[PDB]
Amino acid sequence: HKILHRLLQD
Amino acid sequence: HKILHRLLQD
Amino acid sequence: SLALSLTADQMVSALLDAEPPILYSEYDPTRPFSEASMMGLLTNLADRELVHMINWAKRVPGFVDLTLHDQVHLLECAWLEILMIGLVWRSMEHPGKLLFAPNLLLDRNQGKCVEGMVEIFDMLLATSSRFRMMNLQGEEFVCLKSIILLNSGVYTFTLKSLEEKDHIHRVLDKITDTLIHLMAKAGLTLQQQHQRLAQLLLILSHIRHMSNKGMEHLYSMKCKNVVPLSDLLLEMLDAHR
Amino acid sequence: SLALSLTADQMVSALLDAEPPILYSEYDPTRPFSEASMMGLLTNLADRELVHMINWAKRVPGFVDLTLHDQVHLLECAWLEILMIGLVWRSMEHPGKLLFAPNLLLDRNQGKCVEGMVEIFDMLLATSSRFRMMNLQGEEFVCLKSIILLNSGVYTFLSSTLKSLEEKDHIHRVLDKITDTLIHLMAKAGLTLQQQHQRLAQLLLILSHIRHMSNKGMEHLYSMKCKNVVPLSDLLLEMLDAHRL
Ligand SMILES: Cc1cc(O)ccc1[C@H]1CC[C@@]2(C)[C@H](CC[C@@H]2O)C1
Ligand SMILES: Cc1cc(O)ccc1[C@H]1CC[C@@]2(C)[C@H](CC[C@@H]2O)C1
């Protein structure tokens, strides 16, 4: 998964 | 030439 | 001046009367579509529509008040946007299809014929679907198209000059008055009025987007010698680079 | 739900509270600019602003109601527009200058330091001048920025499927609320009914030029990347790769 994906959860 | 310029006059 | 004197009803009828005709394509169905031939049809059509657009622009209240230099800039900036909004208007009653001409009705799969064009067809179709969902009216459409003409290039124009910008904004305000007046007549509540106004104007942002992408696509087709563009078309395209 | 119940005043304060911080540049003012050094500063800044933008987006009423996928789409489509409108707002009271950061205030000529960037500076400056002459208010700014986030990418949502249509309609409901908010602010400022509608139209039409600047900026940033003038962060690269051009 992309970085943007991760930041939107964290 | 500038066809647009001319077309605007005609 | 005089455009600023126009009533809402006068503004509407003037724009309605200025509407350009619907043109036919030189589509010949005796030969199969190729990337080159489809680009040929579409650009041939666009070229002929441009001539009518230029004369249409002259009939948009306040446009001929501007310098010839500013008229050129506006059309150079908004031409593809104007072609696009007209297209999506023609296609409203044809779900899943784009009515480039009465004899040229294309679906997204036919857009696949040209490299990178289906993405543009998809965006245009979604815009057409949005208009259909909003139940866009003819009077509203002509107002939106004239707004695109006057607005798109105004931010890229100091001297006076500063007066050219002010005049443009005055006319834009008059069209805003016209749109609201139209919605009020239609029976929309005061709240619904400014909500719809916003919805319609926000779509212009997506139309600008489609134009930017379309300009890059048309440019790449040119740079690969896929299609020979008319001198007028080459100059309009050249204005964005 | 939830965001649709908010009052006009509640929408404003919610947006004001969500506002991201004004980041500083690492710029060392003792050293002159090179093409590479300026691109480095600007992209380093943008990269750090993106992290804050993502967390700000989550604080925009109704945004977290959307699927993870849709949130991604909206940000990918709108990130550069959001950076730009922020820039023009910060630079509003600095005519002829672009305040990327309190310690990085660049004038138009310094845009020439980088190939093809001055034309983009010109567009940003003209936008800031338009804001300045309209006397754009802070409460109006926050409304406009949230509108960009929700609006820019909504038209490219894949329809079909029940969930998708429900997403688009939620976005438009929230967008209507923000419109109500903008109008509320103008009515509160004492503008007549006609003036409110005109100002609204004026503000929204600017977003069309902002979209234009983003498209142009994306092409420039992409050209810079390919010419290897500047090393871009992984995040910045993926956001750039979402526009696939
Ligand atoms: C939108 C549109 C409306 C028209 O009335 C005519 C033509 C067009 C497009 C059709 C697709 C293109 C050939 C170019 C722009 C991007 C593509 O290269 C022009
Ligand atoms: C607008 C903006 C606002 C910011 O808060 C940070 C950065 C930027 C720009 C600055 C210029 C660029 C480096 C790219 C886009 C086009 C150029 O490549 C990002």
Residue numbers in the entry:
A (entry chain D), B (entry chain C): 687 to 696
C (entry chain A): 305 to 461, 465 to 548
D (entry chain B): 305 to 549
Question: What's the paper's own text on this?
Answer:
ERα contains structurally conserved globular domains of the nuclear receptor superfamily, including a DNA‐binding domain (DBD) that is connected by a flexible hinge region to the ligand‐binding domain (LBD), as well as unstructured AB and F domains at its amino and carboxyl termini, respectively. The LBD contains a ligand‐dependent coactivator‐binding site called activation function‐2 (AF‐2). AF‐2 binds the signature LxxLL motif peptides of coactivators such as NCOA1/2/3 (also known as SRC‐1/2/3). In the canonical model of the ERα signaling pathway, E2‐bound ERα forms a homodimer that binds DNA at estrogen‐response elements (EREs), recruits NCOA1/2/3 (Metivier et al, 2003; Johnson & O'Malley, 2012), and activates the GREB1 gene, which is required for proliferation of ERα‐positive breast cancer cells (Ghosh et al, 2000; Rae et al, 2005; Deschenes et al, 2007; Liu et al, 2012; Srinivasan et al, 2013).
The 2,5‐DTP analogs showed perturbation of h11, as well as h3, which forms part of the AF‐2 surface. These compounds bind the LBD in an unusual fashion because they have a phenol‐to‐phenol length of ~12 Å, which is longer than steroids and other prototypical ERα agonists that are ~10 Å in length. One phenol pushed further toward h3, while the other phenol pushed toward the C‐terminus of h11 to a greater extent than A‐CD‐ring estrogens (Nwachukwu et al, 2014), which are close structural analogs of E2 that lack a B‐ring. To quantify this difference, we compared the distance between α‐carbons at h3 Thr347 and h11 Leu525 in the set of structures containing 2,5‐DTP analogs (n = 3) or A‐CD‐ring analogs (n = 5). We observed a difference of 0.4 Å that was significant (two‐tailed Student's t‐test, P = 0.002) due to the very tight clustering of the 2,5‐DTP‐induced LBD conformation.
